[PDB]
Amino acid sequence: PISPIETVPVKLKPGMDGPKVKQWPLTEEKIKALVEICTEMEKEGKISKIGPENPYNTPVFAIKKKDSTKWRKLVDFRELNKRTQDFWEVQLGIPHPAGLKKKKSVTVLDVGDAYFSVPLDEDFRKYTAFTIPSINNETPGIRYQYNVLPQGWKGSPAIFQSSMTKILEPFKKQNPDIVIYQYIDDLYVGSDLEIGQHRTKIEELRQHLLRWGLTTPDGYELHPDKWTVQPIVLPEKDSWTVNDIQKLVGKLNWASQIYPGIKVRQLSKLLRGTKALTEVIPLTEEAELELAENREILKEPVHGVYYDPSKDLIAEIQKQGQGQWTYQIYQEPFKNLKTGKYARMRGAHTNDVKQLTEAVQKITTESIVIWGKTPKFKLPIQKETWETWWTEYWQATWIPEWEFVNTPPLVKLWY
């Protein structure tokens, strides 16, 4: 419960204003839950009802952590974050834990409740307004503005960084080889121990946190040890039918954008003429020279590609067949920071939006764990479609920024 505290003053960035998003419609199953979660949260005095005279609004909705559990209210604070004052130097976290990605295991804990004690600057409060849809617009919506740090926000962990550091200092003393990272409502905990012997060090951190007043739920696992790359590969029907040397020289022409050490010549030459695609041309001893050298530069790490903490991260996803997808994360075009292929779908998970969703997340957590920041997505789906389904498969406590596109023949240039 709320500790008598002097409120830290927060402001919106200069020139900007509070958000005025609109509320997507929600189902009956979902509305109900948001209603229960809100009456209690309101008795406990966390959020207070508000009038019309408060211009602002943010979307709220109800996800579900895992299989058949309790509804967890989620608030889309993406818009408030962008407009909210980046803070002094007490960051959301600390100088990113270079080895968080190299640990044998990593567990994710929803620290979120922690923010429920601190009070929120009386002024900044109107800017957190949210509204609850009513089926068939029967009742004029349930309007609520926070009184305490809100779980979604970025101001929260920024503020409660001191408190959390204190709470963790001991666990850090006792266990120095265990790496812990905090990204908003999340504690990333990774160690080089066995899983059974990992799942203990966790429960310990659970109980301890539980002692110092933090009610954490059970836990979520990842192993950034088996994380791998997906490279650009050349075919087996090399230099055969005309078609073949065409796709070949087509593909190898794009990868020049990546590594310019590749050459076209000893292949565009075999291409000279006006021959039927269907022709099994001669794999000349001068083309094999170019292709084996082309084969090589591919099985190799790009040059000059190195992370920069100042530019945004971007990711593109290409659907690619049977429950298979691929992706790329870069800051500056063609200068790849990571290329991979999420593929784990068949039968029951054979739902396009469900698969894309899940992929988006694996890419988002992979960036937190690796760079400690969320990538801006370029989504292979039409705005309206994706918007009528994501939340039905979203389990994470954060929401990345996404933009929608149309994949050209890039799909062929990655699988």
Added chain:
Amino acid sequence: PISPIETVPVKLKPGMDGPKVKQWPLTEEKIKALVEICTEMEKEGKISKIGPENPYNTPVFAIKKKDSTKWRKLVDFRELNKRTQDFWEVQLGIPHPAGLKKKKSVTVLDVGDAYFSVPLDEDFRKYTAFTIPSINNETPGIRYQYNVLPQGWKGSPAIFQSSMTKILEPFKKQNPDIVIYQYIDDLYVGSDLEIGQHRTKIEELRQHLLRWGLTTPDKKHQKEPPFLWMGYELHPDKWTVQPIVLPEKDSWTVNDIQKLVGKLNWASQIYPGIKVRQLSKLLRGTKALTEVIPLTEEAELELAENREILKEPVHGVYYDPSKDLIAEIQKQGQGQWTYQIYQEPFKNLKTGKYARMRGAHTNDVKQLTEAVQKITTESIVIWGKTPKFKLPIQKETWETWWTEYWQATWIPEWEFVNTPPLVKLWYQLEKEPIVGAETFYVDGAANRETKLGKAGYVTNKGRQKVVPLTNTTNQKTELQAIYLALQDSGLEVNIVTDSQYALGIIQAQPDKSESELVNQIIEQLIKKEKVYLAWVPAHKGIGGNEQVDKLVSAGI
């Protein structure tokens, strides 16, 4: 009278000051009524005479037509509403009768002089100040200002919805089964009790309200089947829209167009296609509600079109949560689609038609989809649930579309409806090249400065061709070139381009288009038998591509 309910604090826009517009003199007979209308208003405390300290003013007018035998005082708040802070319009739209369930007894209450009941923030009052002019110009201005929520001011609807939610909050918690619904000044009260025990419950509501200032007049819809609530007729087993009647006139004023614009927006919720866009632009172009405005061609066409729409009689049956929600879709005008949502066959809840731009070019299936996507969201906003879908298209058709399409898409649960205009794919573009077929190494181009450029192939068989094109883009000639290779070609072909632009427009297997050429390219593609469009990079020594350019390229 004036509700002693807690007033809301209203602010102006950050930086703007209050409205100080000038009043324009009416007639000596108009003016005298305006004063008498105002002495009745000051008698009920709705308004209050002011003085030489208030620096603000708002334009007062007098509408000639008496509605319900009342020639009242129209005020122009147009300026104030610009300075008046934003508010929040809570909901996702207006309610729709098919939402309702059958409630034994029903009663609809009308809130008389509703806005005039609820009070206005004592501070924001200096701003709503106006002035009734004088008859003997030897005498000065009759300055007022409001005490209650004005009739056209920006906030009034927003606030009053709040004032009423709080006054019905107690009463709502005590009898949790009786359903009360609220919109403007129409109160829907309905439950499953019998006449006596229920009317007691209405009396109790009427009194609860009266204690708070709101007065429900004797114009109560005492249980008699045709209940008029929100421009609809709630019958015992079905509902029907009250017919919307737009005004027919030749001389429209700033005001008269305004009212209509409103009526149109109201009507636009109940019916689709109703535009307001052009008529709207008449209000931005001129001031003073009295001055006449002549409709344009676009604006007058609009009116005849909406009025056309507003002709088709609409109706439906009420909701039964015990049963499933089914929504059937059909194809129509090469881009026209109809759907009907029902529970019991033949018993319609909602009936409509979806027609929309699937982009510059389009597909047929890729149209059904969007149709589905739009029905789901409408259902979720009315019944909070997704309806089971009946789609006119073979199962393996959809299967073969998402297995191919590079973009992820999805359609929720749906069953096959064997009915006429079946949606399907007209032409399967082959995966691997065909053995034997003629190999058209196409190209084309133009000149941005002249609008003229070439277009034609260079097959494997030695063939050639070209054509001269006038008023074509460096791109449309590239599409054109593919046109040729398609015509001058057998039932099987292996075209090859350098154009990314066309490669795509073709790849997406389009069915229709805005582009004629493309449209033509489609028909041909269907006609043919084994097409194969391939891609190769331009400005390089690839194949025939290297040579077809020279013929098509300008100064070499």
